[PDB]
Amino acid sequence: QVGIPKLEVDHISFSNVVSMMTANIRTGDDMAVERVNPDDVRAINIRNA
Amino acid sequence: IPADELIDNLHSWMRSVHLLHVRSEDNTLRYNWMLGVYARSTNYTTPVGQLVVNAPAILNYSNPQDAFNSVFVALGIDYID
Amino acid sequence: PVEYGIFVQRGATYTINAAGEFEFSGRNEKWDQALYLSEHFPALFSDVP
Amino acid sequence: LKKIAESFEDPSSIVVVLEFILFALFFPTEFNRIKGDIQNVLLLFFSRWY
Amino acid sequence: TVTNEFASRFRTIVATLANVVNERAVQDDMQKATRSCTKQWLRHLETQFD
Amino acid sequence: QQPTGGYTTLEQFAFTIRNDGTNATPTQFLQLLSWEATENELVKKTIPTPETHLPSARNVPGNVYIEDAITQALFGISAQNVNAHGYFSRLSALALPNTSARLGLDGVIYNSETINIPFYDPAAVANFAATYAKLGNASTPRYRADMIDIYAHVGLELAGTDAERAAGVMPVKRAKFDSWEGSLISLSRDVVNWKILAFLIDLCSLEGEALRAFKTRNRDVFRMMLFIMSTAVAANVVNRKVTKRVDRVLEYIGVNSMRTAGRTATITYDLSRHEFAAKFLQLTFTRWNA
């Protein structure tokens, strides 16, 4: 079963699966959101949890 | 303190504290009080407090615990101090 | 200072009970004109010792 | 539901609860799909006035 | 002939609702005022609907 | 498809771990680990029977990876907030009268058997997935597991002699065994591998003569499993240099301390993962004791 982790023993080993992310997972994406500034201010509660 | 100037006096304040509430008729309600007393402490600003004011009935209660769980459930919070 | 404290302390506006006694309220709420018609007399004038 | 963020803490704000009643009445089969995002908005209104 | 089961219904909606605006009290001058007048706009809005 | 007879008693579901040179069975590995018994003590309580209501399968097109998730999370290695978008509950779709979705034999949930892919007999999966659906709702405020207390048990089970485990009491013994350069973490990565599932499905679906008989044969494969995990939540883990070797020591076995910031010699437990192993231990445990 266990294939003896490639890093456990001491033999180099060119070729080995690499899980790389596809074209559908762009990361570091600058994602836009709509921010809503609560109206009032005088209302905005601070204290008590 | 002069027994007189004390009682007489104290009584003035005593008779001042006016706990906001909404009297009822059910023969099982109670009052939680403490929480309330405290809503009064600060002038009804700390949300829990800003709760009772317009919504005073919130304080009466029958199940010693549901009493509070009501407060939380509504203004949604982990704890009140 | 002291007077306007014991007094505004006892409701800033009352309304009237069924047996006509005067029921003051608790908060020292402000008082708008649109609130003029509706069981809520300004409290200063209550003229109650 | 093009999420309508409100606080419901100023009597003039029933305006929004009304948007829905008027809306649900006007196109209810359409409104039905989104009863959830909304049930979602309303309890808040309730936490506030009730 | 003259009743319109539909719009007359919305009419009750502006009351139970309008009524809701009276139970809801406040603690302000702004809140106290606008509440009266919206009780107002709210109604006109309904004849506006009829 | 494919029957059982015993299940874990089958060729491809052999749990090994590899230590020093070749990969050996954890039963043999455990026997290479001793105790330090501290002047403390820990009585075992009584796991509270799990909340009946199994989560709601929830609509979600797509087989989701179950075995990998359940385990990646328990003896993970860096699984962060596990109970968010967590699917574990999607594992309740299997438990039903005549559902279609089968538990792939690779630890994936499919909806409807498919072209060339084994899967446990829907006969037994209906008993496993039956209870572990629960494992889904571990984040639900009103259902969350016991936790801190539930460790009294992982521990006497992992350690304790046949004698302590009989009277409840047992010092909090500290584990030391012979390490070998970053051994605990590696012991663990190796475990994330086991096809856990194959075990559990058998854990709860075997009548009796068979079930108790196996519970005993497999206690060894199981214990190694709690152990890799108990260390996740153990005070300090220190390495002891001796003559030539390094006798690695676990300070306090079976005393969840709530440790949460990334250690190194082991696998951290973000608080969520923490409640989860909490949840996992309770169901699997309440179950081990027929």
The domain segmentation of chain F, as residue ranges, is 1-290
Residues of chain B with Cβ-Cβ distance to D49 below 8 Å are 55
Cβ-contact F121, F3 below 8 angstroms: yes
Total CB pairs under 8 A between chain A and F: 18
Residues of chain C with Cβ-Cβ distance to B11 below 8 Å are none
Report which of B3, B45, B48, B39 is spatially closest to residue B19, judged by C-alpha positions: B39
Residues of chain D with Cβ-Cβ distance to B55 below 8 Å are 49-50
Cβ-contact F102, F122 below 8 angstroms: yes
Cβ-contact F195, F120 below 8 angstroms: no
Both tokens assigned to F215: 């519970």
How close A1 comes to chain D (CA, Å)? 49
Cβ-contact F90, F128 below 8 angstroms: no
- CA quadruple F148, F149, F154, F155: dihedral positive or negative? positive
Residue A48 contacts by C-beta under 8 Å, 6 or more apart in sequence?
A: B46, B47, B48, B49, B77, B80, B81
How close D5 comes to chain B (CA, Å)? 17
F224 membership: H or E segment, kind and range = helix F209-230
Give the number of C-alpha atoms closer than 13 A to the C-alpha of residue F165, restricted to the C-beta side. Answer: 12
Under an 8 A CB cutoff, do C30 and E37 touch? Answer: no
Cβ-contact C14, C41 below 8 angstroms: yes
Cβ-contact F75, F228 below 8 angstroms: yes
Residues of chain D with Cβ-Cβ distance to A39 below 8 Å are 7
**Would you tell me how many other CB atoms lie within 10 Å of the CB of residue F133?**
23
Both tokens assigned to F275: 């409640």
- CA quadruple F196, F154, F213, F132: dihedral positive or negative? negative
Nearest CA in chain D to B74: D47
Breaks (C-N over 2.5 A) in chain B follow: none
Residues of chain B with Cβ-Cβ distance to D10 below 8 Å are none
F177 membership: H or E segment, kind and range = strand F173-178
Cβ-contact B51, B71 below 8 angstroms: yes
Report which of F49, F17, F74 is spatially closest to residue F197, judged by C-alpha positions: F74
E25 has a chain B CB within 8 A of its CB = yes
- What's the resolution in A? 3.1
Nearest CA in chain E to B45: E27
**Would you tell me how many other CB atoms lie within 10 Å of the CB of residue F284?**
20
Q: Identity (one letter) of the amino acid at B61? A: Y
D36 has a chain E CB within 8 A of its CB = no
How close B26 comes to chain C (CA, Å)? 20
Q: Do chains C and D touch (3 or more CB pairs under 8 A)?
A: no
Cβ-contact C12, C29 below 8 angstroms: yes
Sheet of strand C13-16, all strands in order from the earlier edge strand to the far edge: C22-24, C13-16, C41-42
Q: How many helices (H) and strands (E) does chain A have?
A: 0, 0
Residues of chain A with Cβ-Cβ distance to B68 below 8 Å are none
Q: What does the alpha-carbon distance between residue E9 and residue E21 come to, in Å, rounded to a whole number?
A: 19
Report which of F176, F287, F161, F168 is spatially closest to residue F231, judged by C-alpha positions: F176
Only one residue has tokens 């498919």, namely F114
- CA quadruple A10, A13, A17, A18: dihedral positive or negative? positive
A40 has a chain D CB within 8 A of its CB = yes
Nearest CA in chain E to B44: E27
Q: What does the alpha-carbon distance between residue B46 and residue C9 come to, in Å, rounded to a whole number?
A: 19
E27 has a chain C CB within 8 A of its CB = yes
Neighbours of chain E (3+ CB pairs under 8 A): B, C, D
Both tokens assigned to E23: 């139970």
- What b/e string do you get for F149-176 counting C-beta neighbours within 10 Å, with b at 16 or more? ebbbbbbbbbbbeeebbeeeebbbbbbb
Report which of F285, F218, F284, F219 is spatially closest to residue F9, judged by C-alpha positions: F218
